[model samples]
Target chain A: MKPYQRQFIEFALSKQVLKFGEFTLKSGRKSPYFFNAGLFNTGRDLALLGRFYAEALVDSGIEFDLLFGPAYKGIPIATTTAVALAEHHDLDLPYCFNRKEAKDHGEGGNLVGSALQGRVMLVDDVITAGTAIRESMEIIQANGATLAGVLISLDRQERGRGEISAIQEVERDYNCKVISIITLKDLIAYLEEKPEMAEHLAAVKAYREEFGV
Target chain B: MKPYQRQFIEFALSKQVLKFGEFTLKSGRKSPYFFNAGLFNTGRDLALLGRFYAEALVDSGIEFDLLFGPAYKGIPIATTTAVALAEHHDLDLPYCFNRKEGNLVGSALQGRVMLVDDVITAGTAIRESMEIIQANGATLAGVLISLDRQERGRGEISAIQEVERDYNCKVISIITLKDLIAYLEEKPEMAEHLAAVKAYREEFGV
Candidate 1:
């Protein structure tokens, strides 16, 4: 596992944002672990999260113009990443999000900041069913913007419509690269490498075998 | 004005988020100043903006468990502020915002991260405003919302009144729509400022 990936897992664990327990997922599958990107609710966490995202984006070699965060969750993820990108890499990328209700006045743009032109990167917490990513792509494409890529906090790597995971399907269907801070595979690998997480490793491996391909 | 307050104005201006120009406001006031809270776009600006908001909240001496940002603009504002408060003040404030379309599965909650109870409107701001506040185990004593365009709508007061009446949260703002109007109204020292603002208000004032 990469250093930043380890840092992300450790950060998630330290904040109790990522928990390993018997909890049922939205897919109604009983899972041994859960990751809550929302636990990143503070400035420090946001800075750290954005830094990881920035590192990933830079390393991925993906270039884009605007960062489109979908409504609620994507809002902060996109905004913070744009900020981090500017601070870390002198990239003053424009960022925007859709208003629940279109404003009748002011800029009259559904996108709040900068014109949604050129290549756009969709930022979000995670991709469970890829519904949010789909809507974001449609919105960006409709506004004459190109889909640069998708950046997410975590990739569950679980099965989606078919055998392929949601992230894979997104990349395949949209023809856009899907990147994440870390993946379930990365988490399991990191745990396997760490002696302290031996018990967690066993549980994770079992869970993966049960739910993962 | 406080140094942080001044800094906020400067940041807003530098980012072109807030502007001082001859323009018409939503209330039909020709004002010399316009503030677009939306300009805190980049992460650095968000960090700085959140720091100012957290400072103001601390200065106001209010205790809140969750920071509720309204939809659209409030979403990022609340998120960044929560992040700033946690970093600077050691307060891990949970934040949430309403979804235009509530998700049907997993989390039935509309307001993510925290709770979804209150709804703000232009008039009456929705009566269920207290539900989210009460559900979070935290009292809805104050709300650090954005853009209080203080023009009277159909009746009197405006959206701020409904928020105050329903949730009893002390709707704190970075700046008021009234402030812009008053700032323009008082600048008799500048004839252009006075005439422009007065005409705009008369034409657009609700």
Candidate 2:
């Protein structure tokens, strides 16, 4: 595994955002592990998370003009990621996010920050239904901008409505890439190397075999 | 002026967020200068701005449990400031902001919470934030803002002073009217605008 990938997995472990235990996913499947992005709630966590995303984006070699963070969860992720890119990578970019609704005063619109233009990259914690990602594309298209791609924290790599994962569907449907800092394959590789984590490896590999896309 | 404050003023000037000239405020005052925080739209701009906010917050030495950024404008400021605090100052505080749906995001608003915002104009946002914090069973630690106009509000006190008076909490700002004057005084090229600003402050300053 890449050094940053291994570091990120350990970081997630230390923060307890990635847990090893018996768990039931929303898809009604029993799992041996769980990952919660919301557990990344502190300032240091945000800064480090942003750095990881910055690394992933650079590694992916995807080019884009603007970053669009969807409402709620994506707000901070996009903001910090933009900051990290500028501060660490020396690549400054414009960023904006949509409000759940338009405000009557101040910014006076549903969209905040820079105007949506050029290829816009969507930043979010994860893709569950990809509903918000779809909505983000709509917003970008409505603003006369094109969707460059989507960047997320984790890709479950599990089957969605069909044989492929939701992220796969998004890429297939939108013809754009979906970048994740880590995937189930990376997690499995990570667990396989740790003797202490060996107990969880079988279940994880079995689950992946059953649902891997 | 402290380094960050001076740097912020220059940064704001370079971004054209801070313009020196005749302008009208929402209060019907023809001011010698204007500041539009919304113009901070780029990543570099935000990173530097967040550093300024982090400096001011640390300099104030106010203890707090969480940072609550009010909805709309305060969201990014709070978010970036939290990142800056952790990355630069080694302070890892949780931050949250209100959604337009009247729900909270990031972290739960609780304990002694510090409100982060651009400015306290009309104190409407501050009042609303106070209500939200109270509703969440959180006490106001104070407010951390970018600039303090230091001009009188409806009464004799400035909007920031009014907030402090009403809430009994400290109001910290990266720069103030005096700091702006000090900045102008140090630059001979800005003598004309500085003279006008000094006159404006003499007429309306608290």
Candidate 3:
């Protein structure tokens, strides 16, 4: 794992966004950990989180001309990421977000900010069921922009309906890589290194072996 | 005017967000200039614009626990401003925005919001925004914007003044029309428009 990936996991843990416990997930399984991107609710949280994304994007080697954040949750993510890319990486990228209200209005489709052109990157919290991702893909396709890749905070790396994880399925279906700050493998590695997480380590590894992709 | 105020005017001019020409404003007046906040649509624009807001907020000395940006336009403004406050000034602020859908969903109300926006025009939306903030069970401590047009509406008081009268909260702006005129005065190149702008200021300005 990269140094920034480790820092991101530890920082998220400090924020209480990454928790280790027996929690029921939407997939109806007892998961060893839960990651909530919504807890990034302050300016400091966003500023730092944005840098983590910028680092991940650079590490992923995914090239894109612009950014497309889905809405609500994706708005701040794309904003911060673009800002970080500009300030930190010296890569100032144009970005836009879809408005749910505009979609509802129906007279004209709602895509805010710079026009969706060239290779577009989708920035969001996570790809759970791939539903929102699919919708984002549709929106990007509608504007004649191709999906360069997807940038998300965490990838569960667990199996979906069949055997592949949602991120993998998205990569295969869309032919675009999903760049994440960290993954289950990183979480497991962090767990294995700490004596305090010995109990969680086994549980998480067992869960991974059972359902991980 | 503060240095940041001058900086904002110049930046807006560079982006064409602030253009001096013949334009018809919503109040059906032949305006000499147009201020379009929508042109602020990039990372660099937001990073700098947010700082201008932070500076004005600090200088205004308004205290607030949280920020509430109305849907769409105010969303990015509030977000970037909060980040700027935390990053540049070491003032971290909690912020939230109304989701038009969530308002429609309607179960329990949410609020903790000092409103932030680009500009205030007629103050009707603000009256509506005031309702949302009140429903959120929070009072709007202040209203912060990039520019205060300083142009009076039908009532002869500036639109910002009307909004402040309604909310009874201070409206802190990075710059006002007066400041913009002063900025133009300071620019030797803008000498040509100084008289024209000054005339417009007297005629259309209240």
Candidate 4:
């Protein structure tokens, strides 16, 4: 696992945003762990989250005209990352998001930011089914913008439609790169490196081995 | 007419979030001023915006368990306001928003907060609209929004109608389209402001 990926897991755990327990997923699977990006509710958390995303984006060498956060979760994530990019990397990128409801009348642009032209990067917490990402891509494309890639918080790296992971599906269908701060594999590796979490790590690995595929 | 209201308009103008110019609106009106809540993008702007919203909520005296900000524009506002409520009033209000798509696999709760019942629009003109808000553990007492467009919605009071008819929640707003119009109409201290606003209303308002 990459050093930054491990750090991200540590940060997530420190914030208690990521938990390992017996919980049911919407898929009705009894999972051993859960990640709640919403725990990133404060400025400090936002700053750190944005920093991680910005580092990943920079490391990937991805370029885009604007950042597109899909509705709710992505709004602050995109906003904070845009600010971080500007502050740290001197990239004054524009950002926008979609409104669930179309306004009856006003600024016709449901997209709230500089004109979403050129390549746009989509930001979000997680990509479970990739539905929201596709919807956002369609919206941006409908408005004549090209999707650059997607950046998310975590990659469950589990199999989905047609035997490929959802992230893989998104990349294959949209022709856009998908990246996350950490992955299930990376988490497992990080746990192996930390002796204090041996039991928890073993439990997580067991759960992953049983249900990950 | 109040000092705080004036301060809000001033702050909005300074931030370039609110603009006054000859621009066309979706209502097909050539308007004088435009307000874009999305402009509250930065941390400083969010902090100040939340302060203003907190002040309004306090003055209004509405009770709510969770602050439900509608998706998109309302997300930042709701977040910043939640923070401000904590810092300014020592009120650690739980706030949540909805996902465009339902998470059918994991948590069924789409509202990302403590409770999600009786959710109201920020405009404070509606009661209950969505099933998510209804199922929320606690009943939403009222809603507080940034602005109320006040435009007609499908032969009714528009957005406000559904909330009132369905949820029965009180809708409160920091400012309304009518309030803007009326403020301009009566404030003799600024005749120029009134004329520009009135002209915009005449062109677009029904």
Which model scores highest in TM-score?
Answer: 2
- Candidate 4, B1-206: lDDT as tens digits: 56666677678778887776667765565667777766655435655676778778877776665666555455666655665566567786655665545521112333323222212223332222245556644455666766666655445455655555666766666776676766666667667767877765554453
lDDT of 2 by residue, A70-138 (tens): 888888889999999999999889999988776776655789889999999899998977454777877
Q: A213 in model 4: Cα distance from truth in Å?
A: 9.8
Model 2 DockQ vs. reference: 0.79
* Candidates 1 onward: DockQ, in order: 0.32, 0.79, 0.51, 0.11
TM-score, B chain alone, candidates in order: 0.68, 0.97, 0.92, 0.74
What ranking of all candidate models by lDDT puts the best one first? 2, 3, 1, 4
**How would you encode candidate 4's per-residue C-alpha lDDT over A46-139 as one tens digit per residue?**
6567778888888888878788887767887886676667656777676777776676656555666567788989999999885657678778
Residue B201 lDDT, candidate 2, scale 0-100 = 93
Among all candidates shown, the one with the greatest lDDT: 2
- The CAPRI-style docking tier of model 4 reads incorrect
- lDDT score of model 2? 0.89
| Rank by DockQ (best first) | 2, 3, 1, 4
B1-206, model 3: which lDDT tens digit per residue? 77888888889999899998778886688877899988877778878887888888888887787777777777788888888888889987777777775451111234335678999887766787787778768787889998887877887788888877877888888888888788888789887677777888898685
What are the TM-scores, per candidate, against the unseen true structure?
0.78, 0.96, 0.94, 0.64
Candidate 3 wrong stretches, greater than 4 Å:
A103-109, B102-112
On a 0 to 100 scale, what is the lDDT of residue A83 in model 3? 81
Q: Write the per-residue lDDT of candidate 1 for residues A1-213, one digit (tens) a residue.
A: 678888888999998889877788888888878899877765567767878888898889988877888876788788668767766777777788876566765556677766788998888889898565777777788898999999998888888667878898889889989999888898888877789778888888888887674
